[PDB]
Amino acid sequence: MKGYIQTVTGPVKKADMGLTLPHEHLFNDLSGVVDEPFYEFSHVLVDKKVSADIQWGLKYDPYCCCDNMDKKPIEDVIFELNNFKELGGKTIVDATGSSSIGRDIRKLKQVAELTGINVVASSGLYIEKFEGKRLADDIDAMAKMIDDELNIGIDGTDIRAGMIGEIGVSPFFTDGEKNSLRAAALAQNNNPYASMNIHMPGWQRRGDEVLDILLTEMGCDPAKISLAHSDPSGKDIDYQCKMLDRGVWLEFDMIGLDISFPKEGAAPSVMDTVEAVATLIERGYGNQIVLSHDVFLKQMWAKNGGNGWGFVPNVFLSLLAQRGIDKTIIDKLCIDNPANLLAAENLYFQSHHHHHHWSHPQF
Amino acid sequence: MKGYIQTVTGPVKKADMGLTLPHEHLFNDLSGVVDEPFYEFSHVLVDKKVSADIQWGLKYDPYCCCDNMDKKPIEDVIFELNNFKELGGKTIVDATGSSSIGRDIRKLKQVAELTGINVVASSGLYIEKFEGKRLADDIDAMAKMIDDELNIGIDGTDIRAGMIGEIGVSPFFTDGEKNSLRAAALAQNNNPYASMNIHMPGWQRRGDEVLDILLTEMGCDPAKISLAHSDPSGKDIDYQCKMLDRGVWLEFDMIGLDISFPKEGAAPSVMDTVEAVATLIERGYGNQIVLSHDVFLKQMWAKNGGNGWGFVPNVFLSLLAQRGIDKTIIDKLCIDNPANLLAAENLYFQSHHHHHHWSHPQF
C-alpha cells in the first residue's frame, strides 16, 4: 500500500512515476577495465573520442576505447536525457549500485534538479571482477551497507538509493557473488518498497540457481525481484517461462544495444526482442515484463549514433504494435509495469527495522 | 586473357585493381519513391537531414526520410571514399545502372579524378517499380542501349560503363523484368569482359529461375554473373550451394547494412553473414564469393554513424579471421575475387561485334 520510490531528491508516489526506464546508467566509469584491442582494426579506436565516425568499430570492440569507458560528463547526460523527457519520460533508474563501477550520487542529484526527471539511485555490489575482496565481507556487514544507503544516504551525503542492485552474478557465479546475493536479500527483507535488480550472465541460464537462493533460501517476495539482461535468453522460451512461473520480473534491458562483444556474446537484435516480448505477452506474462536500454557506454548515446534513451518508448513500443500486441498492454509496459516492480510494497515484509536483524533479541 | 575493367577514366588491368568493392552506390537518387511514415515515430524523420542523431529511427524506417533518399553531394561522397582509400582501397563499382535510380556519370568521373580511385560505372535497367514501360521495349533495343553504354558512352558523354547491372529482378519478377534480363544477357554475350550483376529479391529464392534464363536459355558464362543481395539467404545453405554449383558468383553486398525495412524484411546481422560466408568457404566455395556494403542511403555513411566503405575490408575480414578462416583465402576475398568477377574474360564469348547480333547476315 502507498507505494513509492525513493529518488535522489525525495519520495515519489507510484501513481506519479509516469514513463519510467528501470535499468540505465547515467554515471558510470569502467576506466579500470579497458581491454586491449581485440582485432586488427581495434588499435585505431583505443585513443579516440567516441563519435558517430567510429561506430563502425565500437560495435565490435566497445571495451578497447578509453573514452567509451570513461566518466560521463553531466552536459552529455542531460542532453541525452532531454530526448527521453521530450517523449514524456518522467522517471529513470541509474543501476550503478557500487563505487566499483563509478556510481556518482552527487551528479545524479544534479541531473534530477536540472531536468526535473525523477532519478533513482541504486545500492548493490557488482561482479567479483570489479568488487574483489569486497564480496568476502560478512553478509550482515554487506546487508547493513545496502540498508544504510537506502535509508540514510550514500558516500557521506543524505542522498538515498531507491533500488537494490544491480547485484553482480558473473558467468562464474563465485562464492562471493552468492554471498553478495544473500546480503541483498537480507537488505530487501528489511525495506518494504525496495526492488532488487540482479545482473544476470545473460548468455547463460543461471536463473534457477539464483532464484533458489533468493526465493527458496532467503524467502524474498518474487514480485520485488527482477532478472536483468534477460534479452539474450529470449529464444529460450522454456527457460524464460520457468523463471516467470516462479513469480519474478524478466527485464529486457538491452533493447537497441546493437553491439557485439568479443567474448560474452552478441546482443540480440531489436526485432529478436520484439518477437520474444510479443510471444511472452501472448503466453499471458505481460504483467511481469519490464523494458530498458542499459545505456552504459558513450557509443550508446543518440548524439553518437546510438539509440539513446528514447528508443524503447518511441520505437520498441511501435514495433510491438505492428507485431499485433494490444494497445492496452503496450501502454502498461513502460508505465504500470515498472511502477509496480519499483514501487509496490513487498507482500512478505511490510516493516522497516532500525536494524535488518530487528527480529532477534538485543538483550 | 588480358583482363581489365573499363573505368570512368579508362581501362585498368585486372592485376592493378587492388582492394575492390564490387557493389556500391556513389550517386543515386530515390526521390521519386519516398514512402509515407510507416510507424507512429516515423513522422519526425520525414523532413530532417540525415545525421547520427536520427539513426535510432532511420534504422527502422529509412525510406520515409526525404534527405536520406535524395541526391548525394560530391563533398560527402569524397569524404566517405577517403575512408576506403586510407585502407588501401583502389577500385569501387557504382551499381546505379539506370537514370531511373539517379545514375550520375559526370560526378562518377569527377570523383575518380579527385581521389585517384578507379571508379566503375554500370549500365542496366532496374526493377519495374522504377523503370515502368522502359522494360516493355524491344529486347534488341534494350541490349543495344547497354552495349552502347559499355562501348561508346553514357548520356551523351564519352564516359563508359564497365559492368552490366544491377539488373532488376523484383519480388514479382515481372514479364518486363524477364525481358530486361534477356537484354542484359544479349549485351553481355557481345562484351567479353563485362560482368553482369543481378539485383535479386534477397528475401526470396528466385535464383534457379533467374539462372534458367541467363544460363540455360541465353547461354551466358556463369563465371561472369553475380547474384546481388545473397545475404538474406545466408542461412539457406542448400539454396546457396545450389546456385554456386551452377557456376555463378554469390555476392554478399549488405555487409554492415544494419537496417530493418518495414516490408521487404530485416537485414542479416554482420555476425550472421560472417557465419554464412565462413561456412561456404569451408564447403570449398571461397573462390566464388564477393563482398560489398551496398551503400545507397545517406544513413549508411560513416559520418552519420553508419558503417561507410571501410567496413568490409577492415572489420568483416577481421571477423572472418577470428572465425578461423585462412589468411590466404581472406586476402583473396576483396582482391583476387572481385578482380576475377569484374575483369576476367568471358569463356564463351571472346569477340565484341560492332552489332550484338553481329553473327547474323547483314545482307
Ligand SMILES: C[As](C)(=O)[O-]
Ligand atoms: C554495467 As552492465 C553491462 O552489467 O548493465
Ligand SMILES: C[As](C)(=O)[O-]
Ligand atoms: C539500389 As539497391 C537497395 O537494389 O542495392
Ligand SMILES: [Zn+2]
Ligand atoms: Zn548488468
Ligand SMILES: [Zn+2]
Ligand atoms: Zn546495467
Ligand SMILES: [Zn+2]
Ligand atoms: Zn539491388
Ligand SMILES: [Zn+2]
Ligand atoms: Zn545496389
